[PDB]
Amino acid sequence: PYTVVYFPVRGRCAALRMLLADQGQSWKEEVVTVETWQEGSLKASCLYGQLPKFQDGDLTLYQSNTILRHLGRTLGLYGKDQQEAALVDMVNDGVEDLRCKYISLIYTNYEAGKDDYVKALPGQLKPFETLLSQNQGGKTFIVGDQISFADYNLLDLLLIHEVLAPGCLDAFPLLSAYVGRLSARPKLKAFLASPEYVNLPINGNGKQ
Amino acid sequence: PYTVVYFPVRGRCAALRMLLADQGQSWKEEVVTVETWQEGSLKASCLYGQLPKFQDGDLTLYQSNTILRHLGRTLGLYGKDQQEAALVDMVNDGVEDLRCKYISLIYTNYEAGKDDYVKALPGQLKPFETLLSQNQGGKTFIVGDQISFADYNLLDLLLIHEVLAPGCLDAFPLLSAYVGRLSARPKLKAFLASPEYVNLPINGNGKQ
Ligand SMILES: CCCCCCSC[C@H](NC(=O)CC[C@H]([NH3+])C(=O)O)C(=O)NCC(=O)O
Ligand SMILES: CCCCCCSC[C@H](NC(=O)CC[C@H]([NH3+])C(=O)O)C(=O)NCC(=O)O
């Protein structure tokens, strides 16, 4: 079945977990502590020496976006055709770019860089609002009329940004309604409210 | 048909161009100068305010990896099945991670960081050598027995790293043979030797 191997944080596993939960999939969580990681064996066995590590049967995967694409490809959450598939990729790559900036702020210079980051935030969120406005008035999904792995990844990006900069979505009606709508999906809503999600820190250094 | 809109550098368009050329595809190059970019209109119209911008008919794409995946999907360079597709993604995501480090060095701190970067290089290249050793002895491609978009992306990564750190591949026999083999492919070889590739700088700040 499915097994996600990761540190006890939401981090880069938050989106894929929301996906599995919303899709009614069952999975096993193999939690790796900082202590165990510092031992060295697991790290050495990891392709790029990092987590998350994912297992689907005897298929062992690394790279969070590879896991998302795999699940999207196998579960039918990758658009209706090649054109939509490309659009889904364009969204996910954009989500990834901002996530990298977020991760850098959180772990590299939270104190000194937070103000500048928050000031620049609107311009970084704007593209996703525009994408929504061009897809059935932002009433459905980020691409097409069916959910894709990029939706879960974007949802997480928006959720963690609300915590970082409360009210950042206020100027973006489509993104706000989008977060509420997706968060209201029955299985996702239950997951987001569960201790499994709630009692896990967003990041590993206690910053958010 | 195909049109790539980018600055006059190889940068993030090198791999996709090698792909198009090796695949015998025709494309148009719309070169954007720093002057024209500084004008602002094109930038404002770009989804994430950046280039490359790609056009496949009326399908307008952004994000270099989205372009690579699109071309890999439409041209049959994405593995033979879902399992291989996931492996192709794992490789490309790894290539992307190192490319980000490379881009940071080149544009952020070449002088002060080059030594540390080059020292860390072997450990960053090792994963691709290992992948190669696990696939038919590294005699064919990075994933499976047919070329994929990840091959072209990895090839470029290796090529630019050879310029940055001459001899870095000497410690990785499979990777060295791989670069020579792929570079020897008729259409690619002609492309790499052409002024269209040769007379373009690798990066935009004159560093390499
Ligand atoms: C400790 C609690 C906080 C953990 C932070 C999240 S894990 C960070 C890091 N992993 C990554 O950055 C994964 C990046 C990879 N590109 C992906 O997308 O999965 C890691 O394994 N780092 C370990 C290492 O490289 O040694
Ligand atoms: C000037 C000659 C050198 C050009 C260097 C490469 S272009 C750099 C930058 N674009 C990107 O970094 C693209 C990143 C994007 N994630 C992708 O993968 O395509 C850009 O458009 N920057 C312009 C901007 O953001 O204003």
UniProtKB/Swiss-Prot annotation, chains A, B:
Q: Where does the GST N-terminal domain start and stop, copy by copy?
A: 1-79
**Annotated ranges, domain GST C-terminal:** 81-202
Primary localization: cytoplasm
* GO terms classed as biological process: animal organ regeneration; cellular response to cell-matrix adhesion; cellular response to epidermal growth factor stimulus; cellular response to glucocorticoid stimulus; cellular response to insulin stimulus; cellular response to lipopolysaccharide; central nervous system development; common myeloid progenitor cell proliferation
A Gene Ontology molecular function term for this protein is:
dinitrosyl-iron complex binding
Keywords, in A-Z order: Acetylation, Cytoplasm, Lipid metabolism, Mitochondrion, Nucleus, Phosphoprotein, Transferase
Q: Give me the residues that bind glutathione, please.
A: 6, 12, 37, 43, 50-51, 63-64
Q: Per the record, GO CC terms? A: cytoplasm; cytosol; extracellular exosome; extracellular region; extracellular space; ficolin-1-rich granule lumen; mitochondrion; nucleus
Task: Give the Phosphotyrosine positions (modified residues).
Answer: 2, 197
PROSITE patterns in the record:
GST_CTER, GST_NTER
Q: Which InterPro entries match?
A: Glutathione-S-Trfase_C-like, Glutathione-S-Trfase_C_sf, Glutathione_S-Trfase, Glutathione_S-Trfase_N, GST_C, GST_pi, GST_superfamily, Thioredoxin-like_sf
User: What role is this protein assigned?
Assistant: Conjugation of reduced glutathione to a wide number of exogenous and endogenous hydrophobic electrophiles. Involved in the formation of glutathione conjugates of both prostaglandin A2 (PGA2) and prostaglandin J2 (PGJ2). Participates in the formation of novel hepoxilin regioisomers. Negatively regulates CDK5 activity via p25/p35 translocation to prevent neurodegeneration.
Assembly and partners? Homodimer. Interacts with CDK5.
Q: What is this protein called?
A: Glutathione S-transferase P
- Organism, per UniProt? Homo sapiens (Human)
**What gene is this protein a product of?**
GSTP1
